[PDB]
Structure formats: C-alpha cells, structure tokens
C-alpha cells in the first residue's frame with residue numbers, strides 16, 4: 611500500500627520523544643498536492659532505531675493496518691521512507707500532541723464533560739476497529755492525539771485521533787510487556803499470542819483511568835516484578851478520585867477476556883451519563 615516518500619523531500623526538525631525502539635520528530639514534507647500545487651506540509655516522523663532494524667516488519671505492519679482503513683478518529687498515514695538503514699514512517703502531525711501530557715498540563719481546567727467526550731470518541735474509534743475485526747494492541751493515552759481543544763465560547767468539543775500501535779506485543783521482549791502492565795492485559799502476559807480483540811477492551815479501560823487521573827500513570831510506583839504480582843493476585847486499579855467512570859473501567863478490565871463488554875455496550879454505558 612505505502613506511498614514511498616523521497617528522503618530529499620523530508621526535513622527533520624525538533625525531537626518530540628520516543629516510543630518502543632523509535633524516536634519521534636516533527637518535520638516537513640515537500641510535496642505536490644491536489645492541483646499540482648507545491649506544499650510544505652507539517653509531518654510527524656517516526657524513526658525505527660538502527661539497532662532494532664530487525665523489527666522493521668512489525669514497525670511498518672503496525673501502520674499499514676491502520677492505513678487500510680479511513681476514519682475521522684484515526685491518524686492519517688502519508689507514507690514511508692526507507693533510506694538504507696533508516697526505516698521511517700510519515701504521518702499526520704496532530705497539533706496539540708499526546709493526550710497523556712495534555713491531561714497533566716491542563717488537569718486543573720479539564721472537567722468531567724471533557725473527559726466523557728474524549729472517552730466517547732475513543733470508544734467510537736475502537737467500535738470501528740472492532741467492527742472491522744482489527745486489533746490495535748497498544749491503546750493508551752500516549753497514543754491518543756488532540757487535534758482540537760475544547761472551545762467553551764462556541765461549545766466546540768475537543769477532538770482526538772488514535773495513532774498506530776507500534777511494534778506488536780506479539781514480538782516484543784517479555785520485559786517490555788511487563789513494564790506495560792496494566793495496559794497489556796493479563797492473558798498477554800501469560801502468552802503474547804493471546805492477543806485478541808478482547809485485548810483492546812482491557813487497554814481501553816486502562817486508558818479511561820488515565821483520562822480520569824489527570825495524566826497519572828497507573829501502577830507507576832510498582833516495579834515490573836510487583837506489576838506481575840499485581841496480575842497474579844487479580845487486583846484492580848483504584849477508582850480515579852474523579853470516579854464517574856470507575857465502574858466502566860473495572861468492567862472493561864475484566865480478568866476474564868470473554869466477559870469484557872462489546873464497544874457497542876461500552877458506548878451505550880457512556881451515553882447514559
């Protein structure tokens with residue numbers, strides 16, 4: 611599928627952070643757009659670490675999956691650039707960046723109706739993926755991007771998009787999956803081949819907890835061994851102090867995967883608030 615983009619049409623600018631075996635940059639893509647018009651377009655650039663180029667297949671598959679669907683709550687993929695040892699994904703630049711950092715910076719002016727709207731949008735995206743039997747596999751607030759802020763004065767809601775999952779937990783080292791507790795569900799800790807649609811219901815619950823906790827990271831105080839034992843003892847997350855969504859979080863984070871609710875049922879629960 612992927613449009614091949616020339617290295618010379620890509621400029622790398624500021625470093626924005628990192629993902630698993632990747633570095634993330636803002637950049638600019640020079641392109642011919644619709645009517646033959648030349649454009650300099652802001653792009654989000656993800657670079658697979660040279661030392662991990664043996665994961666390149668899973669790195670690109672994560673984006674290819676998303677790019678074969680179109681949906682207003684999914685980030686657009688523009689193409690790839692493979693410059694010898696560099697494996698580069700080129701994607702839409704989303705103005706206000708990651709939800710997790712946005713929640714922390716603005717936690718004092720984000721109320722329950724803003725959280726509810728964002729949860730509803732995320733659920734709409736996940737229902738779309740579920741209807742298409744497409745597993746995401748890394749739903750978390752870091753991977754949700756805010757394209758538009760709420761505008762009180764015009765009643766405009768915030769608007770979010772979900773980015774691609776990155777390299778799959780089916781191929782990642784077990785130590786990384788343990789650090790990713792409690793977004794990674796207990797059955798995938800047992801066996802990463804247990805990755806299924808029910809995975810995304812668990813992770814959606816962890817992500818709602820983030821949205822409700824002002825950007826805190828659940829269980830961050832626990833090292834990997836205690837995270838593993840958290841699953842062994844079958845604990846649940848503490849209610850967010852803003853507890854309106856606590857019941858939904860706990861229903862999604864069901865240790866029995868087959869009992870986790872459909873995204874249709876999840877949306878019905880959200881709309882009754």
Ligand SMILES: O=C1CC(c2ccccc2)=Nc2c(-c3ccccc3)c(C(F)(F)F)nn21
Nearest residue numbers: 626627634654702703704705706707708773
């Ligand atoms: O489009 C954007 C825009 C963006 C951004 C960052 C800082 C200020 C304004 C926007 N930050 C990101 C990330 C990102 C995620 C985790 C750590 C660092 C950056 C992603 C990604 F695709 F990687 F999810 N897209 N994105």
